[PDB]
Amino acid sequence: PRDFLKDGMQFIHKCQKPDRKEFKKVCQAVAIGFVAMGAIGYIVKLVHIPINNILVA
């Protein structure tokens, strides 16, 4: 009902939020990891498309 939502609002108001510097730093780190994995996978698939099409008759 509404008691659960009030308890959630209370838990949110009691929680301490991350600052701007920490958020920016962690976002930059996660973005670095994401871009690394994605670019490696994309390069592998792109270079493997024509080699696969030449290998398979």
Partner: protein, 452 residues
């Protein structure tokens, strides 16, 4: 009872002394490229292609492809893990103590079950007539394809230890599924494959399309109207929505309610105990996605045979591959914004089901995982930490006042994030984005805590 099988099964040697962080990262980066290049390579003897793909909805959760060397994927590892974790939780065998030889025999049995189930899966995949026909393909290529699948299964089941035994920074299962989601995002963003559906060929990629449709099209207004938001292929708006969901979940992961605590064995030393708003992170959405995939597969396999029935028709009706007007349809997420706006009751019931299911799954998982208040308070009492209250404030009371609310709120919060990312139209399902964010965040935290 599996003592004689112990010297036969090969296991990776333990590290001599220790491994630095750079060498660990190099081991991980060198063992992941092998998994990728093996997943992109085609098998031999494949004849009958363009065949219906069974366990289609499971390929997003389980790393595999259509006809590559990784058809077995990582299913034996996770299958053995789940069955033996269920056996340990249900307490059927005496394997509960923390003895060294007991856990060694446990891991040996797990590896043996994994390899035998991998062999069984390869055999059933070959002899079911999926790649071809046993009488049509021949009697010589069948055993060759069998051994070609079993060798890859053995390679991956033995390579998992190269990440788990200590040479890797984390586990192996949480990477082979976290890399495919990033792969799908980047390939959906920079796709070079053109799709000529008439009236000029267009690019499947997002940025490639925004460049092409802008450079070789008159009426730049109509060149951007179908480049910012088009519904047929990925666009720029979906990419920006994915970026927004990513930023929001990164910011929201950090909510934690620190509690003051000072030790009592060694006076003076202070500290803090964090309880994140994402308590049991990515567990409830994972359980909900697993349940949804299981019920969808069951409904589809039942409708493929008994479509002319009453209860089957009420369970779910599929059509092109996508359920509609059924229970599985209500469990299915809305396609786009207009698809949500055409039927309000569907969106309402889906929102409510997602929220309630995620919350209740988190609440019932917090008891099985062992992080319950009655457990964590006892663990802290055993470790010696006492609440740094005003006048001997108890720990169990505040801990049991904080933990259940945190869990039952984090479940609904992550469910709402997933449903908002799905309704807004972010690239990839919300489950994929949440997994790819949470796993990377956990590994970043582990790296920051260990060294660097």
């Amino acid at each position: 009872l599996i003592k004689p099988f112990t010297p036969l099964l090969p296991e990776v040697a333990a590290p001599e002394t220790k491994v630095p962080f750079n060498q660990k990262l190099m081991w991980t980066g060198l063992t992941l490229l092998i998994f990728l290049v093996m997943s992109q390579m085609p098998l031999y003897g494949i004849v009958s292609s363009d065949t219906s793909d069974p366990l289609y909805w499971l390929r997003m959760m389980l790393a595999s492809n259509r006809g590559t060397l990784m058809e077995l994927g990582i299913t034996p590892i996770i299958s053995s893990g789940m069955v033996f974790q269920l056996l340990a939780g249900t307490h059927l065998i005496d394997v509960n103590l923390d003895l060294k030889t007991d856990r060694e025999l446990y891991q040996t049995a797990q590896k043996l079950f994994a390899i035998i189930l991998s062999f069984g899966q390869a055999c059933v995949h070959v002899l079911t007539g999926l790649y071809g026909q046993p009488s049509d393909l021949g009697a010589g290529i069948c055993v060759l394809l069998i051994v070609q699948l079993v060798v890859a299964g053995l390679v991956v089941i033995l390579l998992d230890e190269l990440l788990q035994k200590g040479y890797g920074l984390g586990s192996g299962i949480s990477l082979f599924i976290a890399t495919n989601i990033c792969e799908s995002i980047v390939w959906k963003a920079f796709s070079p494959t053109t799709i000529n559906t008439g009236r000029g060929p267009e690019f499947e990629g997002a940025i490639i399309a925004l460049f092409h449709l802008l450079l070789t099209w008159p009426d730049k207004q109509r060149a951007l109207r179908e480049a910012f938001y088009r519904q047929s292929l990925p666009n720029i708006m979906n990419l920006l929505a994915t970026l927004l969901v990513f930023a929001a979940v990164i910011y929201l992961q950090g909510f934690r309610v620190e509690i003051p605590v000072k030790s009592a064995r060694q006076r003076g030393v202070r500290g803090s105990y964090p309880v994140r708003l994402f308590y049991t992170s990515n567990m409830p959405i994972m359980l909900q996605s697993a349940l949804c995939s299981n019920v969808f597969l069951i409904s589809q396999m039942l409708y493929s045979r008994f479509s002319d029935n009453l209860l089957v028709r009420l369970l779910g009706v599929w059509e092109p591959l996508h359920a509609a007007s059924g229970i599985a349809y209500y469990m299915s997420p809305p396609l786009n914004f207009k698809e949500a706006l055409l039927d309000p009751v569907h969106t309402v019931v889906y929102i409510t089901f997602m929220l309630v299911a995620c919350a209740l799954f988190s609440k019932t998982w917090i008891e099985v995982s062992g992080s319950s208040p009655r457990d964590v308070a006892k663990q802290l009492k055993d470790q010696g930490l006492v609440m740094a209250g005003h006048r001997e404030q108890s720990m169990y009371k505040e801990l049991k006042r904080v933990i259940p609310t945190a869990a039952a709120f984090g479940g609904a919060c992550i469910g709402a994030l997933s449903v908002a990312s799905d309704l807004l139209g972010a690239l990839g399902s919300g489950t994929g984005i949440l997994l790819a964010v949470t796993i990377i965040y956990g590994y970043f935290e582990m790296a920051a805590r260990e060294g660097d």
